[PDB]
């Protein structure tokens, strides 16, 4: 590749290197539950506001049901990948060398046991994120544009 | 063996196929069956990409180097990624 401002800069290389997918030195269960929190709380909007029931008074509870399923489907699409791309006793496929050249540990996420932990984090966070939107948006619901 | 490259006895030893292999498959070996006293040979068929230009430059009655496309490998498919 090439070193352009976008691919390397202190602001960029600090933003990416400190979000769950890249914090290579913490337990993959939590790295799954953060990811599912941000994604789950994210997509409750468009389902609730643009779905086929937006006019009806069930727009709150029809979007949430929609987002809940989509998290479930991605949880399956997650598990299909983990079970078909790793073997139960094979080690990690992540790069173990940093840019400076320090040989660090291979990421536990790139591992059958790790990924199956990660999806457990994503699924539980995904549904937890998508209810937390529904509670806020239809209890503590004043300022928003909905 | 990925693809099968075969050179017959019609070949007149003109070294036009060897010079036209883009990945160094064919090569020239001595013979005694031509005026030129040399016939082509294909000892590295693995890297053979299948680009029939190797035998678009064999000037004989039908052909003297022939290429049969078999199964495809990661180098016989010319994948760079």
């Amino acid at each position: 590749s090439l070193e352009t401002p976008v691919t390397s800069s202190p602001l960029v290389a600090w933003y990416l290197s400190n979000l769950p997918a890249y914090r290579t030195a913490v337990s993959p269960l939590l790295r799954g539950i953060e990811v599912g929190l941000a994604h789950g709380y994210l997509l409750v909007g468009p389902f609730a506001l643009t779905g086929p029931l937006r006019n009806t008074p069930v727009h709150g509870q029809a979007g949430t049901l929609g987002a809940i399923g989509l998290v479930s489907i991605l949880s399956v699409c997650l598990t299909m990948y983990g079970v078909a791309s790793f073997n139960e006793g094979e080690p990690s496929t992540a790069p173990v060398l940093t840019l400076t050249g320090r040989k660090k540990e291979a990421d536990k996420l790139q591992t059958a046991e790790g990924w199956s932990q990660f999806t457990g984090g994503f699924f539980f966070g995904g549904v937890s994120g998508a209810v937390w939107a529904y509670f806020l948006l239809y209890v503590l619901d004043l300022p928003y544009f909905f | 063996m990925s693809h099968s490259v075969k050179i017959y006895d019609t070949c007149i030893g003109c070294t036009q196929c060897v010079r036209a292999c883009p990945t160094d498959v064919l090569e020239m070996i001595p013979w005694d069956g031509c005026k030129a006293k040399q016939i082509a040979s294909a000892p590295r068929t693995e890297d053979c990409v299948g680009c029939k230009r190797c035998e678009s430059a064999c000037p004989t009655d039908f052909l003297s180097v022939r290429v049969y496309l078999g199964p495809e490998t990661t180098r016989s498919m010319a994948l760079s990624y």
Binding site: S1, T7, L16, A21, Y81, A84, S85, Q110 | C51, K52, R53, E55, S56, A57, F62, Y68, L69, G70, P71, E72, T73, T74, M77, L79, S80, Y81
Partner: protein, 733 residues
């Protein structure tokens, strides 16, 4: 092996996605499977066949189940001419409210689909009368499907699989198939016609409960034994007959009337019983020809040898063709398709002229949906026959065992065959198009008399030989003197001649100059379609551009740019270009049938007879005019029942237009496009964490052709099938 596909190791180690695509297309090609042997080759086919019968029986149990659970079958019987037959029910949770209303019809309670396959009439005729007959009809076929699945499994274990000599027994098979399969089944269907069907159409309800009490003929089973069979045709159904009751109901069971049933515009029941009885005998007697175990009957090997013409004009004649056929599966399949390809066209041609089911000549849409259906099936099957001809010349032909016989000679003057096919196609092409543009121009300038109207008189002479009196040529069966007329004046002519001159049926429609020009356009299709296929078959083994084509197989991409470029040289590609001309040809046939009938049904027969001589007439008065109701399936004002056909209509246009993308743009461009993409994905953060297991590559050269043709065909069928049904059903006339 080591992974999918289990039957091909060469594909298995292919790392790219090519393996997955090619692990599906080469599933059923049992010869090219690794480690195949001639015993396995047959035993898989035998098990596979039973798989195909399971589908056919399960498929037909679906129709009976829905028609009797969500259909109008008991009500439709009560008035066949005013109750739309119902196919099934609709439950689509995307439907809005005005669609739910619109698709509620046929006297149902929710949305339904109107059945255009014409099952409702067929089951009326053959005696079914309530829902309950249909349910047991469903269960039985479901059981038969279960039985077949057992057999496909059973004949794979040891001690139940046939050996080679069992399959290669070409004589003992032809006796059973001719005498048992074709023969007895036709005899037994006669039994059902005169024990259930005919009694149903006379008010008698006969079922498995009581079919032992009732007599098919009040003196039954006697008159046949004595020899005076002249009683079963005694007192037939009267002219004033109501199909479901006893008024005018005669008692004859076997007749020869030949006309139409006056009320229902169909063939008489008692004729169809006789005919299946007559050809129940021909096959039985034709079934004892060949020798099996009992020392009598011909040897098919001997018959082929004996027919060697003296003088040598046919070389060694048919010598050795026994083994070549009896050892080449691709040969046997080719013959089967050719024969099956013809009779399907025959079925299409006869059904619409001689309606064999009650109240099916006035359901106009059902006629069109059936005749068009069988021609397209016949178009596909006929292309396969030549396609497996080519595979024969490649894989299984042997140039030694067929020395100078009739088969090797067809490879010896292949130039003479190919060129003349080219001539006949060229002669038809220049003049059929030629006279057409001339007809077009002469009308553009406002002079319609200056057209070239050639009266199709030979076909009008033939119609006069069958009794049609419009043209007044006064020949056999149209002239009273003729002994041929006298030979039939008291058997079938009074009914047959009354049907042929009636102007309501489609029996021998009047033909004019328009019908002359179209027929050549049809004739042009068959030669040109044949030319591609026949050119493909005879040059499969080799030609001047590449005289060792046999060493590569039936289907290979090309042979490289040298020698001037060799794109589209495999005999596969000859089949490829062929399909385009099949769809065009069958296009010109079904077009012609629909428009001629759609003018007839309205009683506006002048419109076809004038507009059908210049092309703008076909484009204006058939395409543009008749699609007015279809395209309004949904507009910014509302929707209709026809909306679904309007949607499918465009859906047809969309797939068809996607077809071009794979035919025109060839592989090398897309492959360079993937490589950039497979670079971008490898450098994007958060997305370099997901890695393809199988590397991504563009489709292969042959795959694109196959894929490109799949879209073209699908879009071409759905488009026309939508216009055919919507336009006719829109007017129901």
């Amino acid at each position: 092996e080591l992974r999918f596909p289990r039957f091909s190791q060469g594909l298995a180690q292919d790392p790219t996605t090519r393996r997955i695509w090619f692990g599906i297309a080469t599933a059923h090609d049992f010869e090219s499977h690794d480690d195949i042997t001639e015993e396995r080759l047959y035993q898989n086919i035998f098990a596979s066949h039973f798989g195909q019968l399971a589908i056919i029986f399960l498929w037909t149990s679906g129709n009976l189940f829905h028609v009797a659970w969500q259909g109008n079958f008991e009500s439709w019987i009560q008035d066949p001419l005013h109750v739309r037959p119902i196919a099934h029910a609709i439950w689509d949770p995307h439907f809005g409210q005005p669609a739910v209303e619109a698709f509620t019809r046929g006297g149902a309670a929710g949305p339904v689909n109107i059945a255009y396959s014409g099952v409702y009439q067929w089951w009326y005729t053959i005696g079914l009368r309530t829902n309950e007959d249909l349910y047991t009809g469903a269960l039985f076929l479901l059981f038969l499907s279960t039985l077949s699945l057992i057999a496909s499994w059973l004949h794979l274990q040891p001690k139940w699989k046939p050996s080679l000599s069992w399959f290669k027994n070409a004589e003992s098979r032809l006796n059973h198939h001719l005498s048992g399969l074709f023969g007895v089944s036709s005899l037994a269907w006669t039994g059902h016609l005169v024990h259930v069907a005919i009694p149903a159409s006379r008010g008698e309800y006969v079922r498995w409960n009581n079919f032992l009490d009732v007599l098919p003929y009040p003196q039954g089973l006697g008159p046949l034994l004595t020899g005076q069979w002249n009683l079963y045709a005694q007192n037939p159904d009267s002219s004033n007959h109501l199909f479901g009751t006893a008024q005018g109901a005669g008692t004859a069971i076997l007749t020869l009337l030949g006309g139409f049933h006056p009320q229902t515009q169909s063939l008489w029941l008692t004729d169809m019983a006789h005919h299946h009885l007559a050809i129940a005998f021909i096959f039985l007697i034709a079934g004892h020809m060949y020798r099996t175990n009992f020392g009598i009957g011909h040897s098919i090997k001997d018959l082929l040898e004996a027919h060697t013409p003296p003088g040598g004009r046919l070389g060694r004649g048919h010598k050795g063709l026994y083994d070549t056929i009896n050892n080449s599966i691709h040969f046997q399949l080719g013959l089967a398709l050719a024969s099956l390809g013809v009779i399907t066209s025959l079925v299409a041609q006869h059904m619409y002229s001689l309606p064999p089911y009650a109240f099916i000549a006035q359901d106009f849409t059902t006629q069109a949906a059936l005749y068009t259906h069988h021609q397209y099936i016949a178009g596909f099957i006929m292309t396969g026959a030549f396609a497996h001809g080519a595979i024969f010349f490649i894989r299984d032909y042997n140039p030694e065992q067929n020395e100078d016989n009739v088969l090797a000679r067809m490879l010896d003057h292949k130039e003479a065959i190919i060129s003349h096919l080219s001539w006949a196609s060229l002669f038809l092409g220049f003049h059929t198009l030629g006279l057409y543009v001339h007809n077009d121009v002469m009308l553009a300038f406002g002079t319609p008399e200056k057209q070239i109207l050639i009266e199709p008189i030979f076909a009008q002479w033939i119609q006069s030989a069958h009794g049609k009196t419009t043209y007044g040529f006064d020949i056999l069966l149209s002239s009273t003197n003729g002994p041929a007329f006298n030979a039939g004046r008291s058997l079938w002519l009074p009914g047959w001649l009354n049907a042929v001159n009636e102007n309501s049926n489609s029996l021998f429609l009047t033909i004019g100059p328009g019908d002359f020009l179209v027929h050549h356009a049809i004739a042009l299709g068959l030669h040109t379609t044949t030319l591609i296929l026949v050119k493909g078959a005879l040059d499969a083994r080799g030609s001047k551009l590449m005289p060792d084509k046999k060493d590569f197989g039936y289907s290979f991409p090309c042979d490289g740019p040298g020698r001037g470029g060799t794109c589209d040289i495999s005999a596969w590609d000859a089949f490829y270009l062929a399909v385009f001309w099949m769809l065009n040809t069958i296009g010109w046939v079904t077009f012609y049938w629909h428009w001629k009938h759609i003018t007839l049904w309205q009683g506006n027969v002048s419109q076809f007879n004038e507009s059908s001589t210049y092309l703008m007439g076909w484009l204006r008065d058939y395409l543009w005019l008749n699609s007015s109701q279809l395209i309004n399936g949904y507009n910014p004002f509302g929707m209709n029942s026809l909306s679904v056909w309007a949607w499918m209509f465009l859906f047809g246009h969309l797939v068809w237009a996607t077809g071009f993308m794979f035919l025109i743009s060839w592989r090398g461009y897309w492959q360079e496009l993937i490589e950039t993409l497979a670079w971008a994905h490898e450098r994007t953060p958060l997305a370099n964490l997901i890695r393809w297991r199988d590397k991504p590559v563009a489709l292969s050269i042959v795959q694109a052709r196959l894929v490109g043709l799949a879209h073209f065909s699908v879009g071409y069928i759905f488009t026309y099938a939508a216009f055919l049904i919507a336009s006719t059903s829109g007017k129901f006339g």
